């Protein structure tokens, strides 16, 4: 999220490691539909491969 | 015959009430002294503590200065004071804390368990009974002991007298070897009775039995459920692909 006043790209609140622990913890209780868009989402990982491939 | 019968008795009266059938590879194995030896000796290496320790010349206290000059004094040239040749020097190859336990194949350890269980079966020293294998202590004594009227000195003095005269009538006491009672769970009357009168036998829990404990007394008095769980946990060599394990031939006449 680029800051308006400072023009600096604030690092995401949850790091890519922690984003994978939320997607892995949410998928255990069937709550993966409530998390916002994440590259670690199991559906995003699969969709990106089928769409574009290697 | 492939299978061998096992008569189940009622413990107090020893009345044959049921008949079970086990395979010959469970209670009719040949007597292998070499395999029974490896197992009994494999259990002794595990119960050993092996904490003995000794100080070498590199651990004995003191300074590592040279005692006497290399030459000039006329006496034998000496180095440090912690050498084994000195009075308070260290033992070179002395004991040290290490592990004495050895290894024994699970299949060879199970064959040794069923060989010690068959050595008792063929000699008639394996007396299986029904469940609830506890000493039938008199009801009056149990009512007084639980109530608290009886002091400890009398509560113990009675258990010792009754267990001695109860085991002598059965020819199961010190005058005839001894007996070992193996039960699944801990029963107060039994385990407490053989804690005050130990000369008449002992009691053990299924998990507290070794191959050396089956061979250490005159007789083995085991429960039906205990035996079915004892031979079912030590048939690794057999169950590899079943055999008769508790097959009932004559049912208890309810």
């Amino acid at each position: 999220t680029k800051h308006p006043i400072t023009g600096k790209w604030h690092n995401p609140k949850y790091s890519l490691r922690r984003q994978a622990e939320l997607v892995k913890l949410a998928q255990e209780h069937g709550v993966e539909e409530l998390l916002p868009f994440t590259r670690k989402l199991n559906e995003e990982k699969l969709r990106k491969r089928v769409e574009l491939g290697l | 015959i492939t299978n061998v019968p096992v008569t189940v008795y009622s413990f107090p009266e020893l009345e044959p009430r049921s008949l079970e059938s086990y395979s010959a590879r469970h209670l009719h194995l040949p007597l292998r002294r070499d395999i029974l030896h490896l197992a009994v000796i494999y259990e002794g290496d595990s119960t050993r503590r092996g904490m003995a320790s000794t100080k070498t010349r590199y651990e004995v206290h003191g300074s590592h200065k040279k005692m006497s000059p290399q030459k000039g004094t006329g006496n034998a040239r000496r180095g440090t004071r912690q050498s084994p040749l000195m009075k308070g020097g260290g033992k070179t190859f002395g004991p040290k804390p290490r592990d004495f336990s050895t290894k024994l194949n699970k299949k060879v350890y199970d064959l040794a368990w069923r060989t010690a269980l068959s050595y008792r079966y063929k000699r008639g020293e394996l007396i299986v009974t029904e469940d609830g294998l506890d000493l039938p202590l008199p009801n009056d004594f149990l009512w007084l002991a639980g109530g608290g009227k009886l002091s400890r000195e009398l509560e113990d003095g009675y258990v010792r007298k009754w267990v001695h005269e109860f085991m002598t009538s059965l020819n199961w006491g010190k005058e005839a070897g001894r007996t070992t009672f193996i039960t699944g769970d801990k029963r107060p009357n039994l385990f407490t009775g053989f804690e005050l009168a130990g000369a008449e036998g002992r009691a053990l829990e299924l998990w507290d039995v070794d191959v050396k404990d089956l061979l250490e007394t005159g007789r083995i008095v085991i429960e039906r459920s205990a035996l079915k769980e004892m031979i079912e946990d030590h048939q690794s060599d057999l169950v590899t692909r079943g055999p008769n394990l508790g097959e009932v031939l004559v049912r208890a006449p309810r």
Binding site: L54 | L36, K212
Partner: protein
């Protein structure tokens, strides 16, 4: 008398203990089998030492290299595959996959980098089966099809072969499709399973892709080729003619 006082190991198991330095009559007395005042008596000689003469590995040198990238296949022959079916340890009616080849014991208790089907005993093999392995010899591919069976060579790794035995990955004889006309159907399947299954990897390197791209190995990527097309990703079949 007592049993515990009458046990012992067979005499053939016990051997003499040689305690050196315990008298002349023992036979290992003063010198302790060391000789008389040499280097082997006072100290220790380096094992690699030859007295000064250069070793042959320094006079000739080490020959070759050790390939650290080669795959460690789990060799499987047809002579042994037929024995497991006659014994009832492998169901020939169902597809024989690495999960059922590793759990049966035919290849052993070690999961290596793959499974290759070889052609030992290919003359007495007449059981129609549907097997799937990582590789197969030329004599094992035609021996499986001569009896009326089907064989397919898929791409596996050491990690993917372990997930198949653990049930963390479902086996499939097809590669992952590519394109936007497959997302709706592939994503549909994932939700229905109601579990987190891992996907089997597809080849990425040139050699790996080419091996499973030709029909000679019955590769599962052979359907991507045209009859005149070659498996190699670089070379092409030249055209015969005068022009």
């Amino acid at each position: 008398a007592s049993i515990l006082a009458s046990l012992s190991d067979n005499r053939g198991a016990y051997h003499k203990r040689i305690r050196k330095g315990r008298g002349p009559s023992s036979g290992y007395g003063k010198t302790a089998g060391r000789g008389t005042k040499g280097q082997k008596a006072h100290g220790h000689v380096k094992p690699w030492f030859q007295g000064g003469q250069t070793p042959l590995i320094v006079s000739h040198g080490r020959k070759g290299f050790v390939n650290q990238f080669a795959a460690d296949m789990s060799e499987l022959n047809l002579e042994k595959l037929q024995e497991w079916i006659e014994a009832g340890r492998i169901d020939p009616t169902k597809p024989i996959t690495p999960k059922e080849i590793i759990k049966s014991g035919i290849i052993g208790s070690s999961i290596k980098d793959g499974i290759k089907l070889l052609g030992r005993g290919k003359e007495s093999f007449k059981i129609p089966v549907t097997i799937t392995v990582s590789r197969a010899s030329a004599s094992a591919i035609e021996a499986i099809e001569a009896a009326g069976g089907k064989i397919v060579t898929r791409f596996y790794t050491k990690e993917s072969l372990k997930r198949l035995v653990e049930g963390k990955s479902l086996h499939t004889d097809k590669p992952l499709p590519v394109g936007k006309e497959h997302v709706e159907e592939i994503l549909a399947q994932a939700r229905s399973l109601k579990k987190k299954y891992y996907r089997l990897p597809d080849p990425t390197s040139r050699w790996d892709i080419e091996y499973y791209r030709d029909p000679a190995h019955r590769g599962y990527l052979s359907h991507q080729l045209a009859p005149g097309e070659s498996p190699s990703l670089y070379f092409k079949v030249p055209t015969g003619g005068e022009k």
